[PDB]
């Protein structure tokens, strides 16, 4: 059944078996039905929950003309650098928050479902660019990166290697190298006397 | 027009030595995980092993049933996947396949075998 | 390197029957297990990866769950060409497959 009273399919996000990789991190525009983020704010579910530009208790307060829900998996370490004002390798070559980000940011530990004895490989960030993403920007690109003034002549080597690098998701390893899911939350509000909404 | 063709294979003798070669086209070689999946005449289907990317290392794992006595190479400049097969038993008369692992675009999924070629047959008797 | 035991290894059903096949694994394995099909004198053809997730152009007859020890395949109703065998795949800790399921069909 579909309606537009229906709960927002925030399972689809949250419980999907599979995340993107962080260099092509999932976009998905939530629209027509019902949300309690108050529910997702005190879920001990999420070991990072973060907002920015409003507060979490309010969110169900206000109207919205556009809400994404962007997820990606990076390592442990990185969870710091989603957020804005940050730098870092994920920060700078794979997702960038916008110094005024409206939105929260949400994060669990899932060793548990994207670890795998002897490492998992499918998950992959990109460690080479020539400059720094702007903001929600998305760079899926495979092409052999340049570094010194040679050129790559499309084929790795000297001073010419991949753009993106693996993550090998053991489940021994320590938690800063553990997989963690990220949500990002972003939303778009109605330009609206505070009367209405 | 993602394609694997195995070669190499036939009758060979109790404990001699075969190898067998892959050619694959259609797709970039170096970036692939590629393994070996044997059948025997009948039976069900055994992982023989595997060999990651030089991306990712270019590390190899084996199943015990051939461990110290298969050994698998790759030759990214030609394209090409080996398996050298030493001390052959009879319980190795199969017909051997190389599969490559299930990549669409951003997505990955290693060691789904989406890729198969038609499989050699390797008869081990005297 | 973990145990797939595959059941039933033979099942009779009839063009519109649901079929339901099981593997359980020796130990968890998450969602990293992959049904294939093979039909004969072909290489085996992958149908589910990730336990869920059907590969691109694969009939929507055909729907695997599960996770941590045990997994379905399930045919909601079948089809003449869906005769095959087929087989589970752990990719967990190595690479190891199920003992097949023959699915005759019934006419």
């Known amino acids: 059944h579909h309606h537009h009273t229906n709960l927002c399919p925030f399972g689809e996000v949250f419980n999907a078996t599979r995340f993107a990789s962080v260099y092509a991190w999932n976009r998905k525009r939530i629209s027509n039905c019902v949300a309690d983020y108050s529910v997702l704010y005190n879920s001990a579910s999420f070991s990072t929950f973060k907002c920015y530009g409003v507060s979490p208790t309010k969110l169900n307060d206000l109207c919205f003309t556009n809400v994404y829900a962007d997820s990606f998996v990076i390592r442990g370490d990185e969870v710091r650098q989603i957020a804005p004002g940050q730098t870092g390798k994920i920060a700078d070559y794979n997702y960038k928050l916008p110094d005024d980000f409206t939105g929260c940011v949400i994060a669990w530990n899932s060793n548990n479902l994207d670890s795998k004895v002897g490492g998992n490989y499918n998950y992959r960030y990109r460690l080479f660019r020539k400059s720094n993403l702007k903001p929600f920007e998305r760079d899926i690109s495979t092409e052999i990166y340049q570094a010194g003034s040679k050129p790559c002549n499309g084929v790795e080597g000297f001073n010419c290697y991949f753009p993106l690098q693996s993550y090998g998701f053991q489940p021994t390893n320590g938690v800063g190298y553990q997989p963690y899911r990220v949500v990002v939350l972003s939303f778009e509000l109605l330009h609206a006397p505070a009367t209405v909404c | 027009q993602v394609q694997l063709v195995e070669s190499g294979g036939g009758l060979v003798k109790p404990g001699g030595s075969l190898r067998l070669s892959c050619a694959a086209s259609?797709?970039?070689?170096?970036?692939?995980?590629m393994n070996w999946v044997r059948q025997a005449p009948g039976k069900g289907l055994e992982w023989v092993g595997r060999?990651?990317?030089?991306?990712?290392?270019?590390?190899?794992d084996h199943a015990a049933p051939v461990k110290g006595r298969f050994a698998i190479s790759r030759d990214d400049s030609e394209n090409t996947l080996y398996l050298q097969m030493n001390s052959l038993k009879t319980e190795d008369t199969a017909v051997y396949y190389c599969?490559?692992?299930?990549?669409?675009?951003?997505?990955?999924?290693?060691?789904?075998?989406?890729?198969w070629g038609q499989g050699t047959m390797v008869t081990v008797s005297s | 390197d973990i145990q797939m035991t595959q059941s039933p290894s033979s099942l009779s059903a009839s063009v519109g029957d649901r079929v339901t096949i099981t593997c359980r694994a020796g130990?968890?394995?998450?969602?990293?297990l992959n049904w294939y099909q093979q039909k004969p004198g072909k290489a085996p053809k992958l149908l589910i990866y990730?336990?869920?997730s059907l590969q691109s152009g694969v009939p929507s007859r055909f729907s695997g769950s599960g996770s941590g020890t045990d997994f379905t395949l399930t045919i909601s109703s079948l089809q003449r060409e869906d005769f095959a065998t087929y087989y589970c795949?752990?990719?967990?800790?190595?690479?190891?497959f199920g003992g097949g399921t023959k699915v005759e069909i019934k006419r």
């Open positions: 599969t490559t692992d299930w990549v669409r675009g951003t997505l990955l999924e290693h060691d789904a075998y989406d890729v």
């Open positions: 259609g797709f970039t070689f170096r970036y692939a995980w």
């Open positions: 060999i990651r990317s030089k991306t990712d290392g270019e590390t190899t």
């Open positions: 130990q968890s394995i998450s969602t990293f």
């Open positions: 990730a336990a869920s």
């Open positions: 795949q752990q990719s967990y800790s190595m690479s190891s």
